[PDB]
Amino acid sequence: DWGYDDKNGPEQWSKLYPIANGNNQSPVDIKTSETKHDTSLKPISVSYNPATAKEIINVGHSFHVNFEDNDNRSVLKGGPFSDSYRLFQFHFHWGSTNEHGSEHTVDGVKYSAELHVAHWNSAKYSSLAEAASKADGLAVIGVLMKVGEANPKLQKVLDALQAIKTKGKRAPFTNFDPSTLLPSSLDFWTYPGSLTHPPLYESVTWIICKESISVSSEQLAQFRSLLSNVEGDNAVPMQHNNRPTQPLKGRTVRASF
């Protein structure tokens, strides 16, 4: 089993998953003086149906909000993509304290948390399971979360956590459009990368928003009060789940702006 402890964490993942030392690993530090503006990048277009929201689940190291993905009711288009990508999940990463928590960094600056909105290429593949290992299979929007004022748009998510406190618990999570969590501007960086935890597939086209969203210190505390243990065991809070940034290995981060 992999995790984020010193024994099973990011620094040891390569033992079980050798791709952890690959050439397209995520997250990365975005150095803005080295980004390349691309005039061929179109605007990001998201159109999500709130009826596709399905379920929230404690997965031990984090929690996931999953969506019905049987059709194109909820899609991401534009940016670097010619294909439509179907929403299937969003989740967060956070750190042990406010000073860190994001996965991507910008000019070395660490933010308090990071939102990931994940999609799969339904123009080319028939399912998430098929798409997840293909180089053009996944598209994930990352939004950096800067500690400050409480973010009211997180409210439904935060209010749901008390029903999935321990590992494996799950509950209906319906009628929610996660485009309400995105920043007002969708100016972005993009680069070819990977899942940020095992199985670390190098299948993700990343879309990192330039604008951050807010989160309060107490809202972050609610994430960290989720438990990684199963019901009845000694409580083990989910203190953190962000991977360190990884070498670019010659990749180009492109800017839409």
Ligand SMILES: NS(=O)(=O)c1ccc(NC(=O)NCCNCc2ccc(F)cc2)cc1
């Ligand atoms: N933090 S993140 O990079 O946004 C991020 C991290 C992890 C995920 N999870 C997945 O992608 N699960 C797909 C796994 N499907 C089973 C499977 C697929 C292929 C295969 F060969 C064997 C089994 C999503 C986003």
Ligand SMILES: [Zn+2]
């Ligand atoms: Zn993630």
